[PDB]
Design a protein around this ligand. Sequence first.
Ligand SMILES: CCCCCCCCCO[C@@H]1O[C@H](CO)[C@@H](O)[C@H](O)[C@H]1O
Ligand SMILES: CCCCCCCCCO[C@@H]1O[C@H](CO)[C@@H](O)[C@H](O)[C@H]1O
Ligand SMILES: CCCCCCCCCO[C@@H]1O[C@H](CO)[C@@H](O)[C@H](O)[C@H]1O
Ligand SMILES: CCCCCCCCCO[C@@H]1O[C@H](CO)[C@@H](O)[C@H](O)[C@H]1O
Ligand SMILES: CCCCCCCCCO[C@@H]1O[C@H](CO)[C@@H](O)[C@H](O)[C@H]1O
Ligand SMILES: CCCCCCCCCO[C@@H]1O[C@H](CO)[C@@H](O)[C@H](O)[C@H]1O
Ligand SMILES: CCCCCCCCCO[C@@H]1O[C@H](CO)[C@@H](O)[C@H](O)[C@H]1O
Ligand SMILES: CCCCCCCCCO[C@@H]1O[C@H](CO)[C@@H](O)[C@H](O)[C@H]1O
Ligand SMILES: OC[C@H]1O[C@H](CO)[C@@H](O)[C@@H]1O
Ligand SMILES: OC[C@H]1O[C@H](CO)[C@@H](O)[C@@H]1O
Lengths: 478, 477
Amino acid sequence: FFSTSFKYVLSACIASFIFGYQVSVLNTIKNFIVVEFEWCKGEKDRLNCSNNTIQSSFLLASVFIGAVLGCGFSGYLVQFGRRLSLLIIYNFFFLVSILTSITHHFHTILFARLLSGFGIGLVTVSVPMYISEMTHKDKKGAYGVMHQLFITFGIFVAVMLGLAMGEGPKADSTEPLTSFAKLWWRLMFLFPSVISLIGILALVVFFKEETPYFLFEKGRIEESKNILKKIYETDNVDEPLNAIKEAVEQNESAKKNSLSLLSALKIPSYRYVIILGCLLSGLQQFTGINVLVSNSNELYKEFLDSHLITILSVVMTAVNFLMTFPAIYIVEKLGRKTLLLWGCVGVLVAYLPTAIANEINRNSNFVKILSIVATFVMIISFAVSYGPVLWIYLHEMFPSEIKDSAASLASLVNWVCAIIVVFPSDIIIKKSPSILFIVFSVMSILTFFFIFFFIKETKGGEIGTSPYITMEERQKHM
Amino acid sequence: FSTSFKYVLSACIASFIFGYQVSVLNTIKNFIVVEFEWCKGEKDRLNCSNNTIQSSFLLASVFIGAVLGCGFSGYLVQFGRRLSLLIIYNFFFLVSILTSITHHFHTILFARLLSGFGIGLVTVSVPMYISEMTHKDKKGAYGVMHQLFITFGIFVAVMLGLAMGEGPKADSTEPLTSFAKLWWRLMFLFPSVISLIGILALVVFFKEETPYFLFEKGRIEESKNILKKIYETDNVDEPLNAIKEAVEQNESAKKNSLSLLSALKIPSYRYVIILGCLLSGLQQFTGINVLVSNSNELYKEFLDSHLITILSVVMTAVNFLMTFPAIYIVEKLGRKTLLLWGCVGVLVAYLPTAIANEINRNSNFVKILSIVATFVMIISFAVSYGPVLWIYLHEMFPSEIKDSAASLASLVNWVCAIIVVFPSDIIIKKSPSILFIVFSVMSILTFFFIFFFIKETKGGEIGTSPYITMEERQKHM
Ligand SMILES: CCCCCCCCCO[C@@H]1O[C@H](CO)[C@@H](O)[C@H](O)[C@H]1O
Ligand SMILES: CCCCCCCCCO[C@@H]1O[C@H](CO)[C@@H](O)[C@H](O)[C@H]1O
Ligand SMILES: CCCCCCCCCO[C@@H]1O[C@H](CO)[C@@H](O)[C@H](O)[C@H]1O
Ligand SMILES: CCCCCCCCCO[C@@H]1O[C@H](CO)[C@@H](O)[C@H](O)[C@H]1O
Ligand SMILES: CCCCCCCCCO[C@@H]1O[C@H](CO)[C@@H](O)[C@H](O)[C@H]1O
Ligand SMILES: CCCCCCCCCO[C@@H]1O[C@H](CO)[C@@H](O)[C@H](O)[C@H]1O
Ligand SMILES: CCCCCCCCCO[C@@H]1O[C@H](CO)[C@@H](O)[C@H](O)[C@H]1O
Ligand SMILES: CCCCCCCCCO[C@@H]1O[C@H](CO)[C@@H](O)[C@H](O)[C@H]1O
Ligand SMILES: OC[C@H]1O[C@H](CO)[C@@H](O)[C@@H]1O
Ligand SMILES: OC[C@H]1O[C@H](CO)[C@@H](O)[C@@H]1O
């Protein structure tokens, strides 16, 4: 259904779109910066050299480290508001897009990409929590899948705009880049400025209210009543205010007992749910998803040419975008634990045979075809499950007293594990893919058993509840 | 050097960064011109048309950013004064970082645009913070600290550029020294370290907000606490009542929906608003920013490179030394007196030079007269108009529009900088007699405007203005 809840969640999905677009737009056009910026002007080949590898590694380290920092600071910025965080995100990305688009050196664009990763880190926490507190509880997951839905649409859009370009600068060539190339790569960088302005317009014109949970939590009880009546489309909103009123009584009880996130870590009951979130969020990167997102080109560069890789990237990202839709219906109909475990199964289906085949014959044609299609398996499984479900889960698994802080910590762990996985995986897939893919298979099975034994279902809960800490296991202790 | 002094110095670190970011670009610009190679397609590597165009753009970006920063600081300060200082510090930390690593005209232009945004934030936030963290009897004396450290920042900026050689020759082609390629980025970055120092100072010792704002927003007991902290005495009910009346006038004004534009329709408020705008913008018609912005362009014609070095150093040092006497005089004499004497001084500086250029444009003594007249103008501005304006704008408004109108006037100052400096940069190139006679006419006009319209504001309680009286503020619609 397209309700008021849906309009507001969509308002936040613009920040989600900027998330995805900034994740992938660098990789879309990086050959053209390598040529234009003359990173390899001393070697025979202009797209591949020592200098390019070094600096292009840093241009990803920027995104990931800035996302670590941005998720860390999202915990203290959301303290001062959710809708505020969306306006900060939009106003921030507007300027960072401008700067990225006007840089003429590796340092300025490294700075701009680190700022862009900080924006990513803000979005990761801000948008899913906003959707968590701005939605009908029955539809928390359906609309939380919209977060990842629009992230994926951002990636797909970034890939689609690059095809308006010339689809390659000759590497062996000494030919300067086309004027339209030199322009459209900067224009692609700047497009998110327009998108940011659109988000700001939508926030300031139509969707002015903040989340009912927050307003009730900060004393403005009648503004809570108003915006909750507006997301629920009725004057009768007793039960959601009961959810919010009890969760907020819990927040202030905990703050009376001085239960900061660190103090809760000295409490076992809270520490268990916290570390469960940390591990579920850090394991999302052990799929190698950003090994494929960052090095979508570098992986298949051994056995494929430019045209097929263009088409591959397009259909890969489009399949990614189209497989998030089913998750909208699955996350709610089945449950989150269910879809998560099915995702593990899909990723194992993908990785184990590539490991086996590479162990048989790395240089096999069957191995190359199998690599292509196993990649698509990983994508179809990731897009319909873990992707959406993690950001849905993290803002439903935590008690109200540490709901916001714990979510930011888990998102920080997500980006830190991205650092852990992506950068060594591109060393190992170069050396021995069998080691890599057997590790990812074992991680699929390990994560499966972890989720099966420890991870509990979270569908349908009111705001500020956890299946890990009952009500009495948290008020009296906190 | 009371507690109020500690708090105002905490705010004056931002004033230091203000001045530094203002003159640091101009101090080392030759070096960037050589690195970025804006004029390499000619025989002369420092002087060409493209340099003129892009340098004018860099200065205009700073000015436009200051306009935007003051206008936005009006809306920012309602969320906090010390908050404005924090946002400014973080902002300039990262802007100094970016300014330091720029390698193109566009990135450094964008960097200076943001630097000007922070400039405009400071221009409004810092004088207000000092206005509300000090004794009502010492608002002016501590308000000079703002401009005192501003001038100190310009002095530091010019001083550090001397550690360089100033050997990016116009006739040479020799590549810049490694230390030279390093030091101007280090100078752009130094305000990052200074921003860190300021953030530290604010967050550790000077945690409390201003009493006026705290009472404006409900924290009455914390208003009392920080009031007793700055005043070093607990029974300070009189400042609390000044705040109570100003804040009650604020709440009653918002009750009738008094925004700045709503006050513009009531003549009572519109009068003091346009007085503020005019007094604030008239500070720029002294030609002070024509000299600060185009310091080298004025004396490159009759002065050599080393001679420009010493002249800039000593006039900037004089600016800084002569901002000190205002600290005592603003409180001993008042603002109107010191303003009128400043107009006198500026006329003494310009009018002899104006007539002298018509006497003999190419006179050996006209150059000497211009040097002495420059120092007369510098001394005149630094001790009076410079310090006094930002003191005046945060005492002359009723509290219903105190912050909003203060921000509007501080904005107008920067708009007038644009209206003056660039037409001045073009006119002084043609006929200094006309420009100096116009600046002298402006001295006379400013003198009479201040003389007839501008009232004394010393000793007024916070939220008090000599233009609108307490019962007049009540005048029901
Ligand atoms: C977050 C972004 C930070 C990027 C800058 C990190 C420090 C890089 C060291 O300085 C570099 O030294 C080179 C000569 O040695 C110069 O060619 C180059 O211009 C300069 O930048
Ligand atoms: C206490 C919370 C109230 C703040 C929200 C009020 C409505 C939205 C205002 O957002 C505006 O977005 C612009 C982006 O261009 C900013 O430039 C501008 O400064 C800011 O005012
Ligand atoms: C409140 C005191 C701190 C609790 C310490 C954490 C260990 C107890 C948590 O129970 C867990 O329940 C799961 C059922 O879903 C089991 O599968 C799992 O084996 C078990 O560990
Ligand atoms: C879920 C994983 C999705 C991975 C998608 C990452 C996209 C980055 C791949 O860059 C590709 O480089 C080519 C030139 O080299 C371009 O022609 C092409 O447009 C672009 O797509
Ligand atoms: C985290 C990985 C994301 C899924 C990608 C699946 C396999 C990608 C193909 O890899 C490439 O093909 C051969 C193996 O198939 C190797 O010989 C080659 O060195 C490797 O670069
Ligand atoms: C109150 C008036 C303040 C005016 C100060 C303006 C400073 C900018 C002038 O540039 C000067 O040019 C030289 C090379 O061009 C530099 O070496 C020198 O350090 C610098 O000072
Ligand atoms: C890149 C350098 C690191 C930037 C970090 C910015 C400083 C954190 C924000 O400041 C804090 O805001 C609170 C407002 O309530 C105050 O309570 C507290 O005293 C103050 O310290
Ligand atoms: C904002 C102005 C500050 C005070 C003015 C005095 C210092 C500048 C002097 O001007 C310069 O010296 C001669 C004027 O006597 C002219 O020959 C020359 O064309 C002119 O460029
Ligand atoms: O969907 C692809 C992206 O989503 C994840 C976060 O949800 C990122 O790590 C990944 O690059
Ligand atoms: O030191 C003089 C400076 O003060 C004025 C602001 O009051 C600036 O324009 C000028 O650079």
